[PDB]
Design a protein around this ligand. Structure first.
Ligand SMILES: Nc1nc2c(ncn2[C@@H]2O[C@H](COP(=O)(O)CP(=O)(O)OP(=O)(O)O)[C@@H](O)[C@H]2O)c(=O)[nH]1
Length: 326
């Protein structure tokens, strides 16, 4: 029982915790939100009912209890159950899939949701939080980013990603959550459809940029800025869409292949011009950073001292039940 203009998919524990701040917005009809996870451990106190919560189930129809950072543990079940999620929870006109590249559940059900929505022709913008605390997390993040790039190339439709880092500038998880919440709120205001000069076709061409730009469909990065100071550093984006308050001066000095304009209603919570910029020039740095983390963890792993193994003849001596040598 919520408005379906904007749909938020909280995938995994990181997605569910990030999106827990938008429950009141669902209560106010601003947007609809669906929790997708393999575990209910994080969702023990959510205000939203179980009709907005979907938990993956195994063959026996029993709800799972997390993947434990093992992407291949339940990948088949997730990929098989993704269409049922979209049937039960009707995807919104604009979808904001939030997931973490490091977990074993969000990093699988996130890209699966994105790929299924893109194949259905839906408009989806991802919010991504990547962590590099353990080697398994780094490998999962690298695999998920490669999979998203492959999905963008093979679906002939860009995968728009709002990339965030847990360890960037020494920020805690709370700061990253606040950043993702700001990005999601700005996207919800952009996708509300109440902007004066912004149409559905404009947003369709903005998200599916190669329709107008003609560039190769690849993974695209989304950056959000307030004011006009961002024109100096991102003067050459692929595309950008700006929402202005009342009697706000336009943005100049930006040379983009595609551009859109919108006007915020007088009652909307926007007081300065907000821009949504698409670019792929910073993807190389992200890939290099992920590869550096993977290389660091692999060089740490190769230095592991070999575990002291008991003799093979001792294992022959241990063929009795209980592995007692006597
Ligand atoms: N910035 C944030 N990072 C988070 C948050 N929750 C988890 N994480 C980070 O993400 C990593 C764990 O990934 P997830 O929480 O998505 C694990 P997942 O839910 O897929 O596994 P299960 O708990 O078995 O379902 C780990 O590095 C955490 O520090 C969060 O709310 N914010």
């Amino acid at each position: 029982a919520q408005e379906n203009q904007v749909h938020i998919w909280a995938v995994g524990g990181c997605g569910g915790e990030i999106g827990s701040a938008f429950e009141g917005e669902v209560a106010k009809g601003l947007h609809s939100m669906t929790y997708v996870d393999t575990s209910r451990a994080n969702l023990r106190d959510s205000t939203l009912g179980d009709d907005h919560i979907y938990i993956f189930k195994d063959a026996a129809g029993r709800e799972l209890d997390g993947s434990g950072k093992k992407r291949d543990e339940n990948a088949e079940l997730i990929c098989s159950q993704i269409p049922g999620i979209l049937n039960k929870h009707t995807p919104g006109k604009f979808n904001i899939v939030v997931f973490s590249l490091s977990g074993g559940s969000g990093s699988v059900a996130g890209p699966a949701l994105v790929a299924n929505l893109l194949e259905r022709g839906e408009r989806v913008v991802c919010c991504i939080v990547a962590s590099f605390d353990d080697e398994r997390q780094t490998i999962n993040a690298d695999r998920t980013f490669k999979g998203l790039m492959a999905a963008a190339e093979g679906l002939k439709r860009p995968v728009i990603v709002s990339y965030h880092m847990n360890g960037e500038n020494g920020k805690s998880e709370q700061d990253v959550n606040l950043d993702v919440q700001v990005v999601i709120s700005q996207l919800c205001v952009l996708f509300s459809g109440e902007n004066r000069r912004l149409d559905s076709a404009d947003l369709e061409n903005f998200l599916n940029h190669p329709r107008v730009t003609g560039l190769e469909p690849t993974i695209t990065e989304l950056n959000t800025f307030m004011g006009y100071e961002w024109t100096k550093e991102n003067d050459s984006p692929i595309a950008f869409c700006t929402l202005y308050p009342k009697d706000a001066t336009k943005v100049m000095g930006v040379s983009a292949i595609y551009s859109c304009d919108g006007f915020v209603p007088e009652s909307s919570p926007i007081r300065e011009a907000t821009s949504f910029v698409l670019s792929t020039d910073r993807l190389g740095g992200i890939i290099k950073q992920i590869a550096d983390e993977a290389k660091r963890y692999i060089e740490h792993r190769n230095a592991r001292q070999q575990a002291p193994k008991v003799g093979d003849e001792t294992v022959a001596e241990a063929k009795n039940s209980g592995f007692l040598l006597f």
